[PDB]
Amino acid sequence: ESLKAMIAWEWTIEKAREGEYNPQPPDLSGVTLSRELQAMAEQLAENYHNTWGRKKKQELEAKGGGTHPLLVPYDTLTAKEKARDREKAQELLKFLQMNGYAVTRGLKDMELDTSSIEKRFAFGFLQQLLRWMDISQPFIAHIKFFAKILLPLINQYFTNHCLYFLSTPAKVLGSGGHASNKEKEMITSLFCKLAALVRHRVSLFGTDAPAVALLPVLTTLFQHIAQHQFGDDVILDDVQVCSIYSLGTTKNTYVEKLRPALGECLARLAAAMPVAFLEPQLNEYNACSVYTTKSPRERAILGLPNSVEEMCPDIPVLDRLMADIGARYTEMPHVIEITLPMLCSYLPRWWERGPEAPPPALPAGAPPPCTAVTSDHLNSLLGNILRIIVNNLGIDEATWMKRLAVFAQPIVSRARPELLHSHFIPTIGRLRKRAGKVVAEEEQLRLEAKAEAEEGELLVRDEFSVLCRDLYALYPLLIRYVDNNRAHWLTEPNANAEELFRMVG
Amino acid sequence: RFFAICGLQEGFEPFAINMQRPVTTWFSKSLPQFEPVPPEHPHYEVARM
Protein backbone atom coordinates (compact mmCIF):
# COMPACT_ATOMS: atom_id res chain seq x y z
CA GLU A 1 0.00 0.00 0.00
CA SER A 2 2.85 2.39 0.83
CA LEU A 3 4.82 1.67 -2.36
CA LYS A 4 1.69 1.94 -4.50
CA ALA A 5 0.96 5.26 -2.79
CA MET A 6 4.47 6.38 -3.77
CA ILE A 7 3.94 5.23 -7.35
CA ALA A 8 0.61 7.08 -7.57
CA TRP A 9 2.06 10.17 -5.86
CA GLU A 10 5.70 10.25 -7.03
CA TRP A 11 5.78 9.92 -10.82
CA THR A 12 9.60 10.01 -10.66
CA ILE A 13 10.95 6.65 -11.86
CA GLU A 14 14.24 6.15 -13.73
CA LYS A 15 15.03 3.69 -16.50
CA ALA A 16 17.89 1.33 -15.63
CA ARG A 17 18.09 -1.71 -17.96
CA GLU A 18 16.32 -3.14 -21.00
CA GLY A 19 13.95 -6.11 -20.97
CA GLU A 20 15.96 -9.16 -19.90
CA TYR A 21 37.51 -10.20 4.10
CA ASN A 22 38.00 -7.54 6.82
CA PRO A 23 37.84 -4.07 5.22
CA GLN A 24 38.39 -1.53 8.00
CA PRO A 25 35.28 0.71 7.71
CA PRO A 26 35.78 4.49 8.31
CA ASP A 27 33.32 6.98 9.84
CA LEU A 28 30.49 8.41 7.71
CA SER A 29 29.32 11.37 9.90
CA GLY A 30 32.23 13.74 9.31
CA VAL A 31 30.53 16.40 7.15
CA THR A 32 27.93 18.80 8.53
CA LEU A 33 24.17 18.57 7.92
CA SER A 34 22.89 21.13 5.41
CA ARG A 35 19.35 22.46 5.02
CA GLU A 36 18.75 20.38 1.88
CA LEU A 37 19.56 16.94 3.32
CA GLN A 38 17.68 17.60 6.55
CA ALA A 39 14.77 18.93 4.47
CA MET A 40 14.77 15.67 2.48
CA ALA A 41 15.14 13.47 5.58
CA GLU A 42 12.40 15.31 7.46
CA GLN A 43 10.31 15.10 4.27
CA LEU A 44 10.71 11.32 4.43
CA ALA A 45 9.83 11.47 8.14
CA GLU A 46 6.88 13.74 7.29
CA ASN A 47 5.78 11.27 4.62
CA TYR A 48 5.92 8.56 7.29
CA HIS A 49 3.90 10.93 9.52
CA ASN A 50 1.27 11.63 6.86
CA THR A 51 0.98 8.00 5.73
CA TRP A 52 0.84 6.57 9.25
CA GLY A 53 -1.58 9.29 10.34
CA ARG A 54 -3.80 8.58 7.34
CA LYS A 55 -3.76 4.87 8.22
CA LYS A 56 -4.47 5.82 11.83
CA LYS A 57 -7.34 8.10 10.72
CA GLN A 58 -8.66 5.15 8.73
CA GLU A 59 -8.50 3.09 11.93
CA LEU A 60 -10.20 5.88 13.93
CA GLU A 61 -13.10 6.10 11.50
CA ALA A 62 -13.08 2.28 11.17
CA LYS A 63 -13.47 1.52 14.91
CA GLY A 64 -16.27 4.06 15.41
CA GLY A 65 -14.07 6.98 16.35
CA GLY A 66 -12.95 6.09 19.85
CA THR A 67 -10.49 7.85 22.13
CA HIS A 68 -6.91 7.87 20.85
CA PRO A 69 -4.51 9.46 23.39
CA LEU A 70 -1.69 9.04 20.86
CA LEU A 71 -3.55 11.74 18.90
CA VAL A 72 -1.18 14.57 19.83
CA PRO A 73 0.39 16.98 17.25
CA TYR A 74 3.79 16.72 15.58
CA ASP A 75 5.44 18.93 18.22
CA THR A 76 4.40 16.85 21.25
CA LEU A 77 5.05 13.57 19.42
CA THR A 78 6.87 11.44 21.96
CA ALA A 79 10.38 10.03 21.63
CA LYS A 80 9.03 6.75 20.17
CA GLU A 81 8.66 8.36 16.74
CA LYS A 82 12.04 10.11 16.62
CA ALA A 83 13.71 6.90 17.92
CA ARG A 84 12.00 4.01 16.11
CA ASP A 85 10.90 5.70 12.87
CA ARG A 86 14.47 6.95 12.47
CA GLU A 87 15.79 3.48 13.32
CA LYS A 88 13.68 2.02 10.50
CA ALA A 89 14.62 4.97 8.28
CA GLN A 90 18.38 4.58 8.78
CA GLU A 91 17.98 0.82 8.32
CA LEU A 92 16.42 1.68 4.95
CA LEU A 93 19.27 4.14 4.25
CA LYS A 94 21.94 1.47 4.80
CA PHE A 95 19.74 -0.98 2.85
CA LEU A 96 19.47 1.33 -0.18
CA GLN A 97 23.14 2.32 0.14
CA MET A 98 23.89 -1.24 -0.87
CA ASN A 99 22.32 -2.49 -4.14
CA GLY A 100 22.09 0.97 -5.67
CA TYR A 101 19.05 3.13 -4.88
CA ALA A 102 18.22 6.59 -3.52
CA VAL A 103 15.66 9.40 -3.82
CA THR A 104 16.42 13.15 -3.73
CA ARG A 105 14.41 16.29 -2.97
CA GLY A 106 15.37 19.82 -1.97
CA LEU A 107 15.38 23.59 -2.47
CA LYS A 108 16.34 25.98 0.35
CA ASP A 109 19.08 28.22 1.72
CA MET A 110 19.41 30.51 4.73
CA GLU A 111 19.59 34.00 3.23
CA LEU A 112 18.43 37.60 3.76
CA ASP A 113 14.95 37.29 2.16
CA THR A 114 13.38 33.92 1.41
CA SER A 115 14.32 30.85 3.50
CA SER A 116 15.50 32.48 6.71
CA ILE A 117 12.16 32.50 8.38
CA GLU A 118 12.29 35.85 10.19
CA LYS A 119 13.32 37.46 6.92
CA ARG A 120 10.74 35.25 5.18
CA PHE A 121 7.91 36.88 7.11
CA ALA A 122 9.57 40.31 6.91
CA PHE A 123 9.68 39.88 3.14
CA GLY A 124 6.08 38.70 3.11
CA PHE A 125 5.17 41.88 4.96
CA LEU A 126 7.16 43.98 2.47
CA GLN A 127 5.58 42.16 -0.47
CA GLN A 128 2.07 42.65 0.91
CA LEU A 129 2.96 46.29 1.58
CA LEU A 130 4.08 47.04 -1.97
CA ARG A 131 1.16 45.05 -3.41
CA TRP A 132 -1.22 46.89 -1.08
CA MET A 133 0.08 50.31 -2.07
CA ASP A 134 -0.15 49.34 -5.73
CA ILE A 135 -3.74 48.29 -5.06
CA SER A 136 -4.80 51.23 -2.92
CA GLN A 137 -3.16 54.32 -4.44
CA PRO A 138 -5.80 54.42 -7.20
CA PHE A 139 -8.39 53.66 -4.52
CA ILE A 140 -6.93 56.44 -2.35
CA ALA A 141 -7.00 59.00 -5.19
CA HIS A 142 -10.57 58.36 -6.31
CA ILE A 143 -13.37 48.86 1.83
CA LYS A 144 -12.20 45.63 3.46
CA PHE A 145 -8.72 46.52 2.24
CA PHE A 146 -8.92 49.70 4.33
CA ALA A 147 -9.04 47.48 7.42
CA LYS A 148 -6.44 45.21 5.79
CA ILE A 149 -4.01 48.17 5.71
CA LEU A 150 -5.14 49.53 9.10
CA LEU A 151 -3.93 46.49 11.05
CA PRO A 152 -0.36 45.87 9.69
CA LEU A 153 0.33 49.53 10.47
CA ILE A 154 0.16 48.66 14.17
CA ASN A 155 1.84 45.30 13.52
CA GLN A 156 4.91 46.82 11.84
CA TYR A 157 5.02 49.62 14.42
CA PHE A 158 4.99 47.13 17.29
CA THR A 159 7.53 44.69 15.87
CA ASN A 160 9.94 47.43 14.76
CA HIS A 161 9.70 49.51 17.94
CA CYS A 162 10.19 46.32 19.95
CA LEU A 163 13.05 44.85 17.89
CA TYR A 164 15.81 47.36 17.07
CA PHE A 165 18.87 45.12 17.51
CA LEU A 166 17.63 42.85 14.71
CA SER A 167 19.31 45.17 12.21
CA THR A 168 22.89 45.89 13.20
CA PRO A 169 24.42 42.41 13.91
CA ALA A 170 21.94 40.40 11.86
CA LYS A 171 21.43 40.66 8.15
CA VAL A 172 23.37 40.09 4.93
CA LEU A 173 22.11 43.20 3.14
CA GLY A 174 18.35 43.35 3.84
CA SER A 175 18.95 45.96 6.57
CA GLY A 176 19.16 48.43 3.71
CA GLY A 177 16.87 46.50 1.40
CA HIS A 178 13.64 45.78 3.26
CA ALA A 179 13.91 49.01 5.25
CA SER A 180 14.37 51.12 2.13
CA ASN A 181 11.52 49.34 0.34
CA LYS A 182 9.23 49.97 3.31
CA GLU A 183 10.39 53.59 3.27
CA LYS A 184 9.67 53.76 -0.48
CA GLU A 185 6.12 52.52 0.02
CA MET A 186 5.74 54.92 2.94
CA ILE A 187 6.74 57.92 0.83
CA THR A 188 4.41 56.99 -2.02
CA SER A 189 1.80 56.58 0.74
CA LEU A 190 2.71 60.08 2.06
CA PHE A 191 0.71 62.55 -0.01
CA CYS A 192 -1.92 59.93 -0.84
CA LYS A 193 -4.50 60.47 1.88
CA LEU A 194 -5.38 57.95 4.60
CA ALA A 195 -7.31 58.39 7.84
CA ALA A 196 -5.16 56.58 10.40
CA LEU A 197 -1.77 58.04 11.29
CA VAL A 198 1.49 56.33 10.30
CA ARG A 199 4.07 59.09 10.92
CA HIS A 200 5.11 57.53 14.24
CA ARG A 201 5.39 54.21 12.39
CA VAL A 202 7.56 55.97 9.82
CA SER A 203 9.61 57.56 12.61
CA LEU A 204 10.35 54.27 14.36
CA PHE A 205 11.06 52.66 10.98
CA GLY A 206 13.56 55.45 10.39
CA THR A 207 15.01 54.77 13.82
CA ASP A 208 15.46 51.18 12.62
CA ALA A 209 17.43 52.37 9.57
CA PRO A 210 20.74 53.35 11.25
CA ALA A 211 20.14 50.70 13.91
CA VAL A 212 26.11 50.57 4.86
CA ALA A 213 25.96 52.58 1.62
CA LEU A 214 24.42 50.22 -0.99
CA LEU A 215 21.07 51.66 -1.94
CA PRO A 216 21.13 52.71 -5.62
CA VAL A 217 19.76 49.20 -6.07
CA LEU A 218 17.20 50.31 -3.52
CA THR A 219 15.14 53.40 -4.27
CA THR A 220 16.39 55.06 -1.06
CA LEU A 221 19.21 56.92 -2.81
CA PHE A 222 16.52 58.29 -5.13
CA GLN A 223 13.98 58.55 -2.32
CA HIS A 224 16.30 61.06 -0.63
CA ILE A 225 16.17 63.18 -3.77
CA ALA A 226 12.38 62.75 -3.79
CA GLN A 227 12.05 64.02 -0.22
CA HIS A 228 14.48 66.85 -0.96
CA GLN A 229 12.39 67.95 -3.93
CA PHE A 230 9.32 67.67 -1.69
CA GLY A 231 11.04 69.84 0.90
CA ASP A 232 11.94 72.44 -1.69
CA ASP A 233 8.38 72.45 -3.06
CA VAL A 234 6.74 72.76 0.34
CA ILE A 235 9.24 75.25 1.79
CA LEU A 236 8.79 77.50 -1.25
CA ASP A 237 5.00 77.13 -1.08
CA ASP A 238 4.98 77.92 2.65
CA VAL A 239 7.28 80.89 1.96
CA GLN A 240 4.49 82.02 -0.37
CA VAL A 241 1.74 80.55 1.88
CA CYS A 242 -1.31 70.83 0.55
CA SER A 243 -3.31 67.67 1.38
CA ILE A 244 -0.57 66.13 3.54
CA TYR A 245 2.29 68.39 2.39
CA SER A 246 2.34 70.47 5.57
CA LEU A 247 4.32 70.66 8.83
CA GLY A 248 3.56 66.99 9.57
CA THR A 249 6.40 65.98 7.24
CA THR A 250 8.94 67.91 9.34
CA LYS A 251 8.81 65.45 12.25
CA ASN A 252 9.78 62.59 9.96
CA THR A 253 12.38 64.87 8.39
CA TYR A 254 13.70 65.41 11.92
CA VAL A 255 13.88 61.76 12.97
CA GLU A 256 15.34 60.72 9.60
CA LYS A 257 17.78 63.64 9.44
CA LEU A 258 18.89 63.12 13.03
CA ARG A 259 21.69 60.64 12.31
CA PRO A 260 24.59 62.14 14.27
CA ALA A 261 26.53 58.92 14.88
CA LEU A 262 25.48 56.46 12.15
CA GLY A 263 25.44 58.63 9.07
CA GLU A 264 26.09 55.48 7.07
CA CYS A 265 24.60 56.31 3.66
CA LEU A 266 26.70 57.89 0.91
CA ALA A 267 23.85 59.39 -1.19
CA ARG A 268 25.81 62.59 -1.95
CA LEU A 269 22.98 65.09 -2.40
CA ALA A 270 25.31 67.01 -0.17
CA ALA A 271 25.32 70.83 -0.25
CA ALA A 272 22.85 72.21 -2.77
CA MET A 273 19.39 71.28 -1.47
CA PRO A 274 20.19 71.56 2.28
CA VAL A 275 21.47 75.10 1.63
CA ALA A 276 18.35 75.67 -0.46
CA PHE A 277 16.40 74.84 2.69
CA LEU A 278 18.70 77.05 4.78
CA GLU A 279 18.00 80.28 2.88
CA PRO A 280 14.21 80.29 3.59
CA GLN A 281 15.13 80.30 7.29
CA LEU A 282 16.99 83.58 6.81
CA ASN A 283 14.17 84.77 4.55
CA GLU A 284 11.83 83.72 7.39
CA TYR A 285 13.63 86.07 9.80
CA ASN A 286 10.56 88.24 9.18
CA ALA A 287 7.04 87.01 8.39
CA CYS A 288 7.53 86.91 4.58
CA SER A 289 3.99 85.57 3.95
CA VAL A 290 4.27 82.55 6.25
CA TYR A 291 1.75 81.07 8.65
CA THR A 292 3.68 80.68 11.87
CA THR A 293 6.41 78.07 12.17
CA LYS A 294 6.32 74.89 14.26
CA SER A 295 9.89 73.50 14.33
CA PRO A 296 12.22 76.29 13.15
CA ARG A 297 15.05 75.41 15.51
CA GLU A 298 14.43 71.67 15.21
CA ARG A 299 14.48 71.92 11.42
CA ALA A 300 17.64 74.05 11.70
CA ILE A 301 19.47 71.63 14.03
CA LEU A 302 19.21 68.82 11.42
CA GLY A 303 22.43 70.24 10.02
CA LEU A 304 25.06 67.87 11.31
CA PRO A 305 28.70 68.87 10.63
CA ASN A 306 28.54 67.83 6.96
CA SER A 307 27.59 64.31 8.02
CA VAL A 308 25.99 62.78 4.95
CA GLU A 309 28.36 60.07 5.39
CA GLU A 310 31.07 62.69 5.20
CA MET A 311 30.63 65.71 2.90
CA CYS A 312 31.62 69.38 2.93
CA PRO A 313 29.98 72.30 1.08
CA ASP A 314 30.77 75.23 -1.31
CA ILE A 315 33.38 73.64 -3.67
CA PRO A 316 31.03 71.29 -5.61
CA VAL A 317 28.34 73.98 -5.42
CA LEU A 318 30.46 76.59 -7.22
CA ASP A 319 32.80 74.10 -9.03
CA ARG A 320 30.63 71.84 -11.21
CA LEU A 321 33.38 70.67 -13.60
CA MET A 322 34.57 67.51 -11.82
CA ALA A 323 31.85 67.59 -9.15
CA ASP A 324 28.71 67.40 -11.29
CA ILE A 325 30.34 65.67 -14.29
CA GLY A 326 33.13 63.57 -12.79
CA ALA A 327 34.39 63.76 -6.14
CA ARG A 328 35.17 67.27 -4.87
CA TYR A 329 34.16 66.70 -1.25
CA THR A 330 35.38 65.48 2.16
CA GLU A 331 38.98 66.79 1.70
CA MET A 332 38.92 69.93 -0.51
CA PRO A 333 37.42 72.86 1.48
CA HIS A 334 39.94 73.28 4.27
CA VAL A 335 38.64 76.87 4.59
CA ILE A 336 35.95 77.08 1.88
CA GLU A 337 33.25 75.90 4.30
CA ILE A 338 34.24 78.34 7.06
CA THR A 339 33.37 81.72 5.60
CA LEU A 340 29.70 82.04 6.65
CA PRO A 341 30.50 80.71 10.16
CA MET A 342 32.91 83.64 10.48
CA LEU A 343 30.08 85.90 9.30
CA CYS A 344 27.84 84.41 12.00
CA SER A 345 30.53 85.00 14.64
CA TYR A 346 30.13 88.81 14.47
CA LEU A 347 26.43 89.01 15.46
CA PRO A 348 26.85 88.10 19.19
CA ARG A 349 29.34 90.97 19.36
CA TRP A 350 26.41 93.20 18.32
CA TRP A 351 23.58 91.70 20.40
CA GLU A 352 23.71 93.86 23.52
CA ARG A 353 20.10 95.08 23.51
CA GLY A 354 17.79 93.69 26.17
CA PRO A 355 14.61 92.11 24.81
CA GLU A 356 13.87 89.29 22.35
CA ALA A 357 12.94 91.99 19.81
CA PRO A 358 16.41 92.20 18.15
CA PRO A 359 16.60 88.37 18.03
CA PRO A 360 13.11 87.45 16.73
CA ALA A 361 14.15 84.37 14.71
CA LEU A 362 17.79 84.13 15.85
CA PRO A 363 16.55 81.60 18.49
CA ALA A 364 16.37 79.17 15.52
CA GLY A 365 19.43 80.53 13.67
CA ALA A 366 22.08 80.87 16.37
CA PRO A 367 22.04 77.27 17.83
CA PRO A 368 23.01 75.01 14.84
CA PRO A 369 26.34 76.83 14.38
CA CYS A 370 27.06 76.11 18.05
CA THR A 371 26.01 72.48 17.68
CA ALA A 372 27.46 71.21 14.42
CA VAL A 373 30.45 73.17 13.06
CA THR A 374 31.86 73.43 16.57
CA SER A 375 31.55 69.68 17.10
CA ASP A 376 33.92 68.55 14.34
CA HIS A 377 37.69 68.73 14.99
CA LEU A 378 37.19 70.04 18.54
CA ASN A 379 40.55 68.54 19.52
CA SER A 380 42.15 70.55 16.69
CA LEU A 381 40.32 73.91 17.09
CA LEU A 382 38.90 74.58 20.56
CA GLY A 383 39.07 78.38 20.37
CA ASN A 384 36.10 78.32 17.99
CA ILE A 385 33.82 76.53 20.47
CA LEU A 386 35.30 78.73 23.21
CA ARG A 387 34.35 81.91 21.35
CA ILE A 388 30.95 80.41 20.56
CA ILE A 389 30.29 79.46 24.18
CA VAL A 390 31.32 82.80 25.66
CA ASN A 391 29.35 84.54 22.90
CA ASN A 392 26.28 82.51 23.86
CA LEU A 393 26.95 83.49 27.47
CA GLY A 394 26.99 87.14 26.42
CA ILE A 395 23.83 86.65 24.38
CA ASP A 396 22.14 84.99 27.37
CA GLU A 397 23.26 88.04 29.33
CA ALA A 398 20.37 89.51 27.35
CA THR A 399 18.32 86.68 28.87
CA TRP A 400 19.60 87.86 32.28
CA MET A 401 16.85 90.46 31.88
CA LYS A 402 13.80 89.16 33.67
CA ARG A 403 11.29 88.67 30.81
CA LEU A 404 12.15 88.08 27.13
CA ALA A 405 10.21 85.01 25.94
CA VAL A 406 9.22 82.15 28.25
CA PHE A 407 8.22 80.00 25.25
CA ALA A 408 11.32 80.23 23.05
CA GLN A 409 14.33 80.87 25.28
CA PRO A 410 14.16 77.88 27.68
CA ILE A 411 13.37 75.61 24.72
CA VAL A 412 16.53 76.87 23.00
CA SER A 413 18.49 76.60 26.27
CA ARG A 414 17.55 72.93 26.35
CA ALA A 415 18.34 72.81 22.62
CA ARG A 416 21.95 73.96 23.19
CA PRO A 417 23.29 74.13 26.76
CA GLU A 418 26.31 72.02 25.80
CA LEU A 419 29.85 72.80 26.88
CA LEU A 420 33.08 70.81 26.50
CA HIS A 421 35.76 73.20 27.81
CA SER A 422 33.67 76.33 28.48
CA HIS A 423 32.72 77.17 32.07
CA PHE A 424 33.91 79.28 35.01
CA ILE A 425 37.17 77.30 35.19
CA PRO A 426 37.90 77.24 31.42
CA THR A 427 36.67 80.86 31.28
CA ILE A 428 36.84 83.18 34.29
CA GLY A 429 34.63 85.45 32.21
CA ARG A 430 32.09 82.66 32.67
CA LEU A 431 32.80 82.86 36.40
CA ARG A 432 32.07 86.59 36.38
CA LYS A 433 28.95 85.87 34.33
CA ARG A 434 27.92 83.29 36.92
CA ALA A 435 28.41 86.01 39.52
CA GLY A 436 26.17 88.20 37.37
CA LYS A 437 23.62 85.40 37.27
CA VAL A 438 23.88 85.23 41.07
CA VAL A 439 23.16 88.97 41.18
CA ALA A 440 20.19 88.29 38.89
CA GLU A 441 19.00 85.55 41.23
CA GLU A 442 19.36 88.07 44.06
CA GLU A 443 17.18 90.48 42.10
CA GLN A 444 14.64 87.67 41.72
CA LEU A 445 14.95 86.92 45.44
CA ARG A 446 14.32 90.53 46.44
CA LEU A 447 11.41 90.67 43.99
CA GLU A 448 9.81 87.48 45.33
CA ALA A 449 10.51 88.70 48.88
CA LYS A 450 8.72 92.00 48.28
CA ALA A 451 5.86 90.13 46.59
CA GLU A 452 5.55 87.62 49.43
CA ALA A 453 5.67 90.35 52.07
CA GLU A 454 3.00 92.25 50.14
CA GLU A 455 0.95 89.02 50.08
CA GLY A 456 0.32 89.26 53.83
CA GLU A 457 -3.15 90.07 55.16
CA LEU A 458 -5.28 90.00 51.99
CA LEU A 459 -3.57 92.75 49.99
CA VAL A 460 -4.30 91.51 46.45
CA ARG A 461 -4.82 88.29 44.50
CA ASP A 462 -1.38 86.87 45.22
CA GLU A 463 -2.06 83.79 43.08
CA PHE A 464 -2.54 86.23 40.18
CA SER A 465 0.34 88.63 40.96
CA VAL A 466 2.87 87.21 43.43
CA LEU A 467 2.48 83.76 41.92
CA CYS A 468 2.86 85.09 38.36
CA ARG A 469 6.01 86.91 39.44
CA ASP A 470 7.28 83.58 40.78
CA LEU A 471 6.34 81.83 37.51
CA TYR A 472 8.15 84.32 35.28
CA ALA A 473 11.06 84.26 37.75
CA LEU A 474 11.26 80.47 37.87
CA TYR A 475 10.96 79.40 34.23
CA PRO A 476 13.96 81.28 32.73
CA LEU A 477 15.64 80.52 36.05
CA LEU A 478 14.85 76.86 35.35
CA ILE A 479 16.56 77.15 31.95
CA ARG A 480 19.67 78.81 33.42
CA TYR A 481 19.78 76.39 36.35
CA VAL A 482 19.43 73.40 34.04
CA ASP A 483 22.49 74.64 32.15
CA ASN A 484 24.28 75.21 35.48
CA ASN A 485 23.53 71.83 37.07
CA ARG A 486 24.05 70.23 33.65
CA ALA A 487 27.71 71.17 33.13
CA HIS A 488 28.79 74.35 34.94
CA TRP A 489 29.30 72.24 38.08
CA LEU A 490 30.99 69.56 35.92
CA THR A 491 34.48 71.13 36.32
CA GLU A 492 33.88 73.69 39.07
CA PRO A 493 33.78 70.99 41.82
CA ASN A 494 37.16 69.48 40.94
CA ALA A 495 38.71 72.93 41.28
CA ASN A 496 36.73 73.55 44.48
CA ALA A 497 38.33 70.34 45.76
CA GLU A 498 41.84 71.19 44.56
CA GLU A 499 41.61 74.79 45.84
CA LEU A 500 39.14 77.19 47.42
CA PHE A 501 38.94 79.82 44.66
CA ARG A 502 36.84 77.81 42.16
CA MET A 503 33.37 78.71 43.54
CA VAL A 504 33.99 81.28 46.28
CA GLY A 505 30.92 83.12 45.01
CA ARG B 1 44.42 59.13 44.64
CA PHE B 2 41.23 61.22 44.52
CA PHE B 3 39.12 61.14 47.75
CA ALA B 4 38.03 64.73 47.10
CA ILE B 5 34.50 64.35 45.71
CA CYS B 6 32.10 62.12 47.56
CA GLY B 7 33.15 61.22 51.14
CA LEU B 8 35.62 63.64 52.67
CA GLN B 9 32.85 66.19 53.37
CA GLU B 10 30.11 63.54 53.47
CA GLY B 11 30.79 61.13 56.34
CA PHE B 12 32.31 58.31 54.31
CA GLU B 13 35.40 57.04 56.02
CA PRO B 14 38.78 55.49 55.14
CA PHE B 15 38.54 51.83 55.98
CA ALA B 16 41.91 51.22 57.68
CA ILE B 17 42.00 54.72 59.11
CA ASN B 18 42.93 54.29 62.81
CA MET B 19 45.32 51.36 62.51
CA GLN B 20 49.04 50.69 62.77
CA ARG B 21 49.01 47.74 60.37
CA PRO B 22 47.18 46.51 57.26
CA VAL B 23 44.64 43.74 56.85
CA THR B 24 45.69 40.15 56.23
CA THR B 25 43.83 40.08 52.89
CA TRP B 26 42.75 36.48 52.61
CA PHE B 27 42.62 35.01 49.13
CA SER B 28 41.41 32.07 47.10
CA LYS B 29 43.21 28.77 46.56
CA SER B 30 43.73 26.64 43.46
CA LEU B 31 44.91 23.32 44.89
CA PRO B 32 42.08 20.82 45.74
CA GLN B 33 42.41 19.95 49.43
CA PHE B 34 40.05 17.38 50.89
CA GLU B 35 37.24 18.55 53.14
CA PRO B 36 34.50 16.59 54.89
CA VAL B 37 31.00 16.08 53.58
CA PRO B 38 28.73 19.00 54.48
CA PRO B 39 25.42 17.42 55.56
CA GLU B 40 23.53 20.30 53.91
CA HIS B 41 24.50 19.29 50.38
CA PRO B 42 21.86 19.24 47.59
CA HIS B 43 22.56 15.86 45.94
CA TYR B 44 25.43 14.23 47.87
CA GLU B 45 24.19 12.60 51.07
CA VAL B 46 25.75 9.85 53.19
CA ALA B 47 24.56 7.31 55.75
CA ARG B 48 26.51 5.72 58.59
CA MET B 49 25.21 2.20 58.03
UniProtKB/Swiss-Prot annotation, chain B:
Annotated tissue distribution: Detected in skeletal muscle (at protein level). Fast- or slow-twitch skeletal muscle.
Modifications after synthesis and translation: The N-terminus is blocked. Channel activity is modulated by phosphorylation.
Localization (cell): Sarcoplasmic reticulum membrane
Entry superkingdom: Eukaryota
Note: Binding of [3H]ryanodine indicates that the heterozygous channel is activated by Ca(2+) concentrations 4-fold lower than normal. Single-cell analysis of cotransfected cells shows a significantly increased resting cytoplasmic Ca(2+) level and a significantly reduced luminal Ca(2+) level.
Function: Cytosolic calcium-activated calcium channel that mediates the release of Ca(2+) from the sarcoplasmic reticulum into the cytosol and thereby plays a key role in triggering muscle contraction following depolarization of T-tubules. Repeated very high-level exercise increases the open probability of the channel and leads to Ca(2+) leaking into the cytoplasm. Can also mediate the release of Ca(2+) from intracellular stores in neurons, and may thereby promote prolonged Ca(2+) signaling in the brain. Required for normal embryonic development of muscle fibers and skeletal muscle.
Family according to the record: Belongs to the ryanodine receptor (TC 1.A.3.1) family. RYR1 subfamily.
Domain notes: The calcium release channel activity resides in the C-terminal region while the remaining part of the protein constitutes the 'foot' structure spanning the junctional gap between the sarcoplasmic reticulum (SR) and the T-tubule. Pore opening is mediated via the cytoplasmic calcium-binding domains that mediate a small rotation of the channel-forming transmembrane regions that then leads to channel opening.
Quaternary organization: Homotetramer. Can also form heterotetramers with RYR2. Identified in a complex composed of RYR1, PDE4D, PKA, FKBP1A and protein phosphatase 1 (PP1). Repeated very high-level exercise decreases interaction with PDE4D and protein phosphatase 1 (PP1). Interacts with CALM; CALM with bound calcium inhibits the RYR1 channel activity. Interacts with S100A1. Interacts with FKBP1A; this stabilizes the closed conformation of the channel. Interacts with CACNA1S; interaction with CACNA1S is important for activation of the RYR1 channel. Interacts with CACNB1.
Descriptive protein name: Ryanodine receptor 1
Span within the parent record: 1212 to 1260 of 5037
